[PDB]
Swiss-Prot record, chain A:
The largest part of the sequence forms an elongated and flexible stalk structure that is connected to a C-terminal globular domain with a histone-type fold. This is Centromere protein T. It is linked to Short stature and microcephaly with genital anomalies: An autosomal recessive disease characterized by growth failure resulting in severe short stature, severe microcephaly, and delayed and dissociated bone age. Additional features include global psychomotor developmental delay, pubertal delay and genital anomalies. Coiled coil: none annotated. It is found in: Nucleus; Chromosome, Centromere; Chromosome, Centromere, Kinetochore. Component of the CENPA-CAD complex, composed of CENPI, CENPK, CENPL, CENPO, CENPP, CENPQ, CENPR and CENPS. The CENPA-CAD complex is probably recruited on centromeres by the CENPA-NAC complex, at least composed of CENPA, CENPC, CENPH, CENPM, CENPN, CENPT and CENPU. Identified in a centromeric complex containing histones H2A, H2B, H3 and H4, and at least CENPA, CENPB, CENPC, CENPT, CENPN, HJURP, SUPT16H, SSRP1 and RSF1. Interacts (via N-terminus) with the NDC80 complex. The gene is CENPT. Belongs to the CENP-T/CNN1 family.
UniProtKB/Swiss-Prot annotation, chain B:
This is Centromere protein W. It is found in: Nucleus; Chromosome, Centromere; Chromosome, Centromere, Kinetochore; Nucleus matrix. PANTHER family: CENTROMERE PROTEIN W (PTHR34832:SF1). Gene3D superfamilies: Histone, subunit A. SUPFAM superfamilies: Histone-fold (SSF47113). Highly expressed in ovary, liver, lung and pancreas and to a lower extent in breast and gastrointestinal tract cancers; such as those of the colon, rectum and stomach. Overexpressed in high grade breast invasive tumors. Expressed in many cancer cell types. Keywords: Cell cycle, Cell division, Centromere, Chromosome, DNA-binding, Kinetochore, Mitosis, Nucleus. Belongs to the CENP-W/WIP1 family. It comes from the Eukaryota. InterPro entries: CENP-W (IPR028847), CENP-W/WIP1 (IPR052484), Histone-fold (IPR009072). GO terms for molecular function: DNA binding; protein heterodimerization activity. GO terms for cellular component: chromosome, centromeric region; inner kinetochore; kinetochore; nuclear matrix; nucleolus; nucleoplasm; nucleus. Its main location: nucleus.
UniProtKB/Swiss-Prot annotation, chain D:
Component of the CENPA-CAD complex, composed of CENPI, CENPK, CENPL, CENPO, CENPP, CENPQ, CENPR and CENPS. The CENPA-CAD complex interacts with the CENPA-NAC complex, at least composed of CENPA, CENPC, CENPH, CENPM, CENPN, CENPT and CENPU. Interacts directly with CENPH. This is Centromere protein K. The gene is CENPK. Component of the CENPA-CAD (nucleosome distal) complex, a complex recruited to centromeres which is involved in assembly of kinetochore proteins, mitotic progression and chromosome segregation. May be involved in incorporation of newly synthesized CENPA into centromeres via its interaction with the CENPA-NAC complex. Acts in coordination with KNL1 to recruit the NDC80 complex to the outer kinetochore. Belongs to the CENP-K/MCM22 family. The chain holds residues 109 to 162 of 269 of the full protein.
Curated annotation (Swiss-Prot), chain E:
This is Centromere protein I. Keywords: Centromere, Chromosome, Nucleus, Ubl conjugation. Sumoylated. Sumoylated form can be polyubiquitinated by RNF4, leading to its degradation. Desumoylation by SENP6 prevents its degradation. It is found in: Nucleus; Chromosome, Centromere. Belongs to the CENP-I/CTF3 family.
């Protein structure tokens, strides 16, 4: 008779992925405070997205706002673009929606 | 294996992202906004690189103290450096 | 029972004796046929032509696999066109067997 | 009792040896045909196929 | 009747859907129900198989509809090979959604045997390989690629792709199975050690499993080394391909393909030998090959392996191991059954008897040890007397009556074997010399028998065996 908090369902995905990268046995008490770290990151992440959108004069959040954030984070540099990072870390089905490629009569999707 | 300590995951779960979860969490915190249809995926990418950073820093602290099991004081120390670095 | 067994065993041993010599002569004939062909080692033409084989095969292999992936990525129905259809079937086949 | 045991083993050996003889006859016929076929069956010609 | 209703439904699908006709949806339901009833009752003929699959993957009928045709698809007759080729081409278009794509691969794996010809399927290995990229279809494509894989399909660049997928997803069980199959075909490229056999591909009950029962009714109505291909140090560092290979001349028969006697009959003259020659011991088809070879390197390899193994496994000799007990008996039984065929004894066994006979107590492995004695090659009696019979006689006179009967049995069998081998030679040491040895053996056993009768006080149980010898 299981009952699961929907909020904990989302965090459980990244918590398991954490144990894959660690490559060390990890104590149970370390698990839940990583969950504590994640929600703090999400809260502060959303706050930053407000200002960058607000500065541009549009309330809607567009991808180039996310590019601007990651450049300040140091993830995106002159050599490593946004397209390069998607290729390395995301599956094929997610790649089609994000990165545009021309095919079948020079048709490009998404339009860029 | 004891309940208290969890062994490293040999096989990663399917790389499918929880798109529904990201939309609601972004919705409740800032209801007034609307996010573009593909913006959820990029947020998922941003979260991966954060967790990847957190795992590397925690491992170094555990090895520095000559500990074979990652402990809570190791990861909290990792959190302080990464969280400030993660904000830009 | 013993009277039957003796005859069976005798016939089996005769068969073994005959088969051994027959197979030995076949093996030695086949081995003789192989060795002399290898030792031709003509220098005026053979090494000249063989190196051409080493290069034309490699180029044809690359074109085969490049053409295969372009068809997949173009997202077209190749089976509908008979002219393109028979090209697709030939791509996987090795050029060495040719 | 010993004689009964001997007879049982003799019958089993008989059937097994019969099977072996059948297989070996087949192999002998195959070898004969193959040797006959091979018996029934240079730089200039070699350079041609290349 | 029913056929006419089935025909109208088939043509109805080919016509295409109508947006404004809600009634035809009910007409669709009864038409689609009729196909289901025909499929469950008897299935569908080959001609209409090619029809609906093109329609099902076409995607004008929607995911909700197209899903349930695949479930009810039943091969009453053999599936045409050209039908599958058209179906794969429609997947390249990509109109069908994820649910349709998953169902197609599950169906084809289940229905793999029913395709009449698999030659043109193997020519589409490249297209199935590309689907490994998408995570949704990965477990099912791995199962399909497991069956189609042959030696030509494994290529070095495809080897790199599989390793790259393993870094991203980790230790996926369905990838470990596929990688092992790749290592077997090309051991010079990959090295995998796998822990131990669990079922890698989940044997979940497929949707058509119950229907297959109806279709099946219609159709119905280690001490010894393991077998492995010849060691891959063959060729190894080679400057260039041989001229014979360049001209595609002959070759050898791979060991994995040899699985039936008719296959052995065709290719007896050219065969691939195992990496370790002790594996021939329990393989019946290779025993027929070594029955008539008499080649020297193979004899030496077998000699060294068997002599070392016997020395290490024996019970009263070389560190006196008693733990093996039953294992040694089973090994000896296998050896005896192997040399009853081939109608001769191994050279290793003779050396083992000559070395270990002095230390034997006469009871440990009586049956097998005494059955090894019968297969001693013909030789002059004076030479082998000090080696064998001096120990056998000393063990004979001081033992129980059952040991005496056992040795009389073994000597009778030895005499029969010697006579059998001598008779064929005269059809082909001189003959006068040869008869002297057998006469000396007969006189020796007569001396044994007379003294044994004196020691045992005229027991009739022994006299039966003594007369059994002279019957032969």
């Amino acid at each position: 008779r299981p009952r699961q908090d929907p909020h904990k369902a989302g965090l459980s995905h990244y918590v398991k992925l954490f144990s894959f990268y660690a490559k060390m046995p990890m104590e149970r008490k370390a698990l839940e405070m990583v969950e504590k770290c994640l929600d703090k990151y999400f809260q502060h992440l959303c706050d930053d997205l407000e200002v960058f959108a607000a500065h541009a004069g549009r309330k809607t959040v567009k991808p180039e706002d996310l590019e601007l954030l990651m450049r300040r984070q140091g993830l995106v540099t002159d050599q490593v673009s946004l397209h390069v990072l998607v290729e390395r870390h995301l599956p094929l089905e997610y790649r089609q929606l994000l990165i545009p490629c021309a095919y079948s009569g020079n048709s490009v999707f998404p339009a860029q | 294996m004891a309940l208290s300590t969890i062994v490293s995951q040999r096989k990663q779960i399917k790389r499918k992202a929880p798109r529904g979860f990201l939309k609601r969490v972004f919705k409740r915190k800032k209801p007034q906004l609307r996010l573009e249809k593909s913006g959820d995926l990029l947020v998922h990418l941003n979260c991966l690189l954060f967790v990847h950073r957190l795992a590397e820093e925690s491992r170094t602290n555990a090895c520095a103290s000559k500990c074979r099991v990652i402990n809570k004081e190791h990861v909290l120390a990792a959190a302080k450096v990464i969280l400030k670095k993660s904000r830009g | 029972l013993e009277e039957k067994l003796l005859d069976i065993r005798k016939k089996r041993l005769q068969l073994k004796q005959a088969s051994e010599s027959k197979l030995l002569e076949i093996q030695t004939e086949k081995n003789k046929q192989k060795i002399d062909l290898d030792s031709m080692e003509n220098s005026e033409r053979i090494k000249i032509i063989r190196q051409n084989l080493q290069m034309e095969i490699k180029i044809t292999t690359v074109i085969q696999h490049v053409f295969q992936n372009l068809i997949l990525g173009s997202k077209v129905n190749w089976a509908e066109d008979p002219a393109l259809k028979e090209i697709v079937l030939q791509l996987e086949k090795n050029v060495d067997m040719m | 009792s010993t004689k009964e045991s001997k007879n049982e083993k003799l019958k089993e050996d008989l059937e097994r040896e019969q099977r072996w003889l059948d297989e070996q006859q087949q192999i002998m016929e195959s070898l004969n045909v193959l040797h006959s076929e091979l018996k029934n069956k240079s730089e200039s010609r070699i350079f041609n196929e290349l | 009747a029913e056929e006419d209703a089935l025909q109208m439904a088939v043509g109805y699908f080919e016509k295409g859907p109508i947006k404004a006709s809600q009634n035809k949806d009910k007409t669709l339901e009864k038409h689609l129900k009729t196909v289901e009833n025909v499929a469950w009752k008897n299935g569908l003929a080959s001609e209409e198989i090619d029809i609906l699959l093109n329609i099902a993957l076409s995607g004008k009928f929607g995911n909700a509809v197209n899903t349930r045709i695949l479930k009810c698809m039943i091969p009453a007759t053999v599936i045409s090979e050209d039908s599958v080729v058209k179906a794969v081409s429609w997947l390249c278009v990509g109109k069908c959604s994820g649910s349709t794509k998953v169902l197609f691969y599950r169906w084809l794996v289940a229905m793999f045997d029913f395709i009449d010809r698999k030659e043109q399927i193997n020519l589409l290995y490249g297209f199935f390989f590309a689907s490994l990229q998408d995570d949704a279809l990965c477990p099912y494509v791995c199962h399909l690629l497991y069956l189609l894989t042959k030696k030509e399909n494994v290529k070095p660049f495809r080897v790199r792709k599989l390793l790259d997928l393993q870094a991203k997803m980790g230790m996926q069980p369905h990838l470990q199975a596929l990688l092992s199959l790749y290592k077997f075909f090309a051991p010079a490229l990959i090295s995998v050690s796998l822990p131990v056999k669990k079922i890698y591909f989940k044997n979940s009950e497929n949707l058509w499993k119950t229907a297959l029962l109806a279709v099946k009714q219609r159709n119905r109505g280690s001490v010894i080394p393991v077998l492995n291909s010849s060691s891959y140090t063959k060729e190894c560092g080679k400057k260039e391909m041989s001229l014979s290979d360049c001209l595609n001349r002959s070759g050898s028969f791979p060991l994995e393909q040899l699985q039936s006697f008719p296959q052995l009959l065709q290719n007896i003259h050219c065969l691939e030998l195992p990496s370790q020659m002790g594996s021939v011991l329990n393989n019946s088809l290779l025993l027929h090959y070594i029955n008539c070879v008499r080649d020297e390197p193979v004899l030496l390899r077998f000699y060294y392996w068997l002599s070392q193994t016997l020395q290490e496994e024996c019970i009263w000799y070389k560190v006196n191991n008693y733990e093996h007990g039953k294992e040694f008996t089973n090994f000896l039984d296998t050896i005896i059954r192997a040399e009853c065929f081939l109608q001769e004894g191994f050279y290793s066994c003779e050396a083992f008897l000559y070395k270990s006979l002095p230390l034997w107590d006469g009871l440990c492995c009586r049956s097998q040890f005494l059955q090894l004695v019968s297969w001693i090659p013909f030789s002059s009696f004076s030479e082998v007397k000090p080696l064998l019979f001096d120990h056998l006689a000393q063990l004979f006179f001081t033992s129980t009556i059952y040991f005496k009967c056992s040795v009389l049995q073994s000597l009778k069998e030895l005499l029969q074997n010697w006579l059998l081998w001598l008779s064929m030679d005269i059809h082909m040491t001189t003959l006068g010399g040869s008869m002297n040895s057998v006469s000396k053996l007969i006189h020796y056993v007569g001396w044994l028998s007379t003294t044994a009768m004196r020691l045992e006080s005229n027991n009739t149980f022994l006299l039966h065996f003594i007369l059994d010898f002279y019957e032969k």
